[PDB]
């Protein structure tokens, strides 16, 4: 519920790798299709994420994905630390896969379908996650 | 000054292409290094952008970059239209190139340097652009 906590995980679909970042307090999602699970891709994603949102701590369900020199250097430079302290994260990753399946025919490539699904998830109201994160961040500014 | 207007342009550095999106009302920036200037890369970028921020209209200094079937299909699906209505956009693209030059040694690859520069630009206060965009968006929600 703290506004700087994000959850990062990878999932697999059609032989490809989808990196999914969830803003825990709001359920707002950022995702990316990457060619392979590598430290360089995780580091680049963290650096991008932290330049766009105030990323204070990152949690993950696979701690070993954060052990590479490259990843630690990105967290070091951006000032990110590892979160050492549930149902939100489960529901967001599972709803994402459902939406991807729904819009899969609308897109030539998986990566396009993934961004359509992120779009749909963040705008769908039940307020939307996208409205909740800006409200959470803007109120925290005060 | 309307909260849904973005400016998109490409610039070149070290033989590579940097796609820069500026939120006009705040000066908040999103950037990406792409391998080549193609409609597919512009479309993918727009789709990503619109899933993260409320993108209503897009302006550009090279109108021909928005003519491809691929790009129009992305704007169609995301509900984006073309803005047909100054000093902000100039200052943001020029300050970005300056910061890249400053942090260039800190990074192995240009794309890393670009994300460091985006990070620095959005956080630098003179409020920051990153604080201004969430304030602008959250107030507009009301
Ligand atoms: C494990 As993944 C790369 O996040
Ligand atoms: C994700 As880090 C290593 O903090
Ligand atoms: C011209 As550019 C691709 O924006
Ligand atoms: C950028 As569109 C074509 O609207």
Numbering used by the authors:
A (entry chain A), B (entry chain A): 56 to 140, 148 to 188, 194 to 209
Please give the exact wording used by the authors of the publication that reports this structure.
The integration of the viral genome into the host genome during the life cycle of the HIV-1 virus is an essential process of infection. HIV-1 integrase (HIV-1 IN) plays a key role in virus integration without the need for any other co-factors. HIV-1 IN consists of three domains: N-terminus, catalytic core domain, and C-terminus.
The comparison between the cryogenic and non-cryogenic structures was direct because the crystallization conditions for SFX-XFELs and conventional crystallography were identical. By overlapping the cryogenic structure with the non-cryogenic structure, we observed a good agreement with RMSD 0.31 Å, except for helix III and rotamer changes in the protein residues. Even though the unit cell volume of the non-cryogenic structure was greater (by approximately 3.35%) than that of the cryogenic structure due to the cryogenic cooling effect, we directly compared both structures, and found significant structural changes associated with protein functions and characteristics. When the cryogenic and non-cryogenic structures were compared, the orientation of the helix III was found to have shifted toward helix VI by 7.1 degrees. However, this phenomenon is thought to be a combination of poor resolution and changes in the dynamics of the water molecules as a result of temperature, since several water molecules that cannot be seen in the cryogenic structure are clearly visible in the non-cryogenic structure. At ambient temperature, the number of water molecules making up the hydrogen bond network was reduced from 3 to 1, and the direction of the sidechains, such as Asp64, Glu92, and Asn120, also changed. At ambient temperatures, the non-cryogenic structure had a relatively wider catalytic cavity volume in the DDE triad compared to the cryogenic structure. The average B-factor of the DDE triad in the non-cryogenic structure (94.5 Å2) was 22.2 Å2 higher than that in the cryogenic structure (72.3 Å2), and the B-factor of the DDE triad was 10.5 Å2 higher than that of the entire structure. The B-factor in the non-cryogenic structure of IN-CCD also shows good agreement for their dynamics properties in solution state analyzed by NMR, which is not seen in the cryogenic structure.
